[PDB]
Symmetry: C2
Subunit: 128 residues, 2 copies
């Protein structure tokens, strides 16, 4: 048993990536206003820039732009996760940059079962 098919109508019960994307064309005209989607993820995974690109493309498939491809990702994008440290009794936030080498998804089990890894970006997309 792994991490769930079609994904929950409720809040996930495992780590997940929240994708918040704004799709623009090569001229920055906006095509798709912020669109949100959740993908379950497994701690221990290496998230590279290329993987993120695929996830955002998959995020587009539930929109009028499913036939479009991701051309460029905003170079200022970052993954951030916010949780409550159970030892420190405070809000803590970690940032991970999107790079070619990527980063390994941490296990935040000790603090939260289902952390949400936030990805807010703008991407250039064009029809395939």
């Amino acid at each position: 048993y792994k991490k769930g098919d079609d994904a929950s109508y409720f809040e996930p019960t495992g780590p997940y990536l929240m994708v918040n994307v704004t799709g623009v064309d090569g001229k920055g005209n906006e095509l798709l206003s912020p669109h949100y989607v959740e993908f379950p993820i497994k701690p221990g995974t290496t998230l590279t820039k290329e993987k993120i690109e695929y996830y955002v493309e998959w995020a587009l498939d539930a929109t009028a732009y499913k036939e479009f491809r991701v051309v460029e990702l905003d170079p200022s994008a970052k993954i951030e996760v916010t949780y409550y440290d159970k030892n420190k009794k405070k809000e803590e936030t970690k940032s991970f940059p999107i790079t070619e080498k990527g980063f390994v998804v941490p296990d935040l089990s000790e603090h939260i079962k289902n952390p949400g890894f936030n990805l807010i970006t703008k991407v250039v997309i064009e029809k395939k």
Copy 2:
């Protein structure tokens, strides 16, 4: 609506540079109390925006909501003011970030590229009732 954000606020887009505040109000124990409401304030290039003036702009952005009686307690130390526009010359989108400090920074004049740039403030702020 039941609480129409915008007493008189311009019906059309701003004609000059403006500061856009989009804060999420939280309590100490990390509970979200107020979701980000869109608020605009005109600003002038040449103005110096310090952390104290930013604190007051966000307290004024709360007066537009049901939390009008709350005061700002502590602004996320990692907040920044970001502005995005298309550069006519290079033909690329470009984004500048300014940190919120005591000394502050001066509002730049981007009018060569856009007449009404939007300086964005998007953070969390710990707020308490007066």
